[PDB]
């Protein structure tokens, strides 16, 4: 399955909490956002190629509230969405630095926002108000609302169809919905012992979750089955980040370490200690290169290596 044993640091932007770090549609730019109320955009090649003393964002956009999550648009290169601690979901144009849409219906902090890959005007958010809201960038009002029993910690679109979302809940389950019939979920995935903090898809049928029970889990959303549980990291309290690609899962931990799992193996392939908790991670698509950030504001570019 794998030939890697370590994570190599190839770049570091020295430091507070980065809630989200995300690549744009082409993996050319990345953005960070968190408690400092600023969305910063960096050029990836510049970060990898230039000395640390010359590092500088190419865009900075100040925000009204602390940020919980970012999601770049998959078709409009220059658009990025944020969710904030007032519950507002904003779409920004990084060229003009202006907000394009401000969606203000959530009544408590929104923990996540996700732009759909296949219907790129659609975006979904979830909140402590116990609502999932689906938005379209062509309309000012939400288009779908799902009332749930417990706080929503994460929502993610299936990568092959805008009709399915995974909803990670404070009730310890993943609720997998077909947005064409929200009367009931397609399936509710149980097994985690604590809240589900992230949900991310490896492929159309493979869904991963992270939970504050110190596990990641892999699920099959075609046949509605558990597949695998991953252990080795410490995550009992915070949003510490989850990122997956076709073969690998990476997550943060409360020991200031990034962990990497291959999807077929239950124990970590490797880890990297910063030096506090890791707070955000993002693979560069299917490559072995990853962005990472921690609660002190340090950003590192890591690469899996033999």
């Amino acid at each position: 399955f794998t030939r890697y044993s370590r994570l190599r640091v190839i770049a570091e932007i020295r430091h507070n909490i980065v809630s989200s770090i995300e690549f744009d549609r082409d993996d050319e730019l990345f953005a960070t956002a968190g408690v400092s109320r600023c969305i910063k955009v960096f050029d990836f090649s510049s970060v990898v190629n230039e000395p640390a003393d010359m590092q500088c964002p190419i865009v900075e956009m100040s925000t009204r509230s602390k940020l919980s999550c970012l999601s770049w648009n998959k078709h409009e290169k220059n658009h990025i969405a944020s969710s904030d601690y007032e519950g507002i979901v904003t779409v920004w144009d990084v060229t003009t630095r202006q907000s394009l849409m401000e969606y203000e219906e959530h009544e408590k902090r929104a923990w996540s926002v996700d732009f759909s890959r296949t219907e790129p005007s659609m975006l979904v958010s979830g909140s402590d108000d116990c609502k999932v809201k689906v938005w379209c960038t062509r309309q000012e009002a939400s288009v779908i609302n799902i009332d749930m029993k417990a706080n929503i910690c994460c929502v993610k679109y299936n990568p092959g169809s805008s009709n399915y979302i995974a909803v990670g809940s404070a009730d310890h389950h993943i609720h997998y919905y077909d947005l064409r019939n929200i009367s009931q979920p397609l399936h509710v995935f149980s097994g985690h012992k604590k809240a589900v903090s992230y949900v991310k898809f490896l492929s159309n049928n493979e869904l991963a979750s992270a939970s504050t029970d110190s596990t990641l889990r892999l699920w099959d959303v075609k046949d509605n089955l558990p597949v695998r549980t991953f252990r080795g990291h410490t995550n009992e309290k915070n949003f510490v980040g989850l990122t997956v690609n076709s073969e690998y899962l990476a997550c943060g931990s409360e020991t200031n370490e990034v962990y990497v799992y291959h999807k077929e193996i239950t124990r970590p392939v490797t880890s990297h200690r910063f030096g506090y908790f890791i707070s955000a991670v993002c693979w560069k698509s299917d490559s072995p290169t990853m962005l990472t950030a921690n609660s002190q504001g340090t950003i590192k570019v890591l690469v899996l290596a033999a």
């Binding site: 602390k66 809940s169 809240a195 949003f239 609660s295």
Partner: peptide, 9 residues
């Protein structure tokens, strides 16, 4: 602090 605490139901 508490700002990134994942809520428990």
């Amino acid at each position: 602090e508490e700002i990134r605490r994942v809520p428990e139901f």
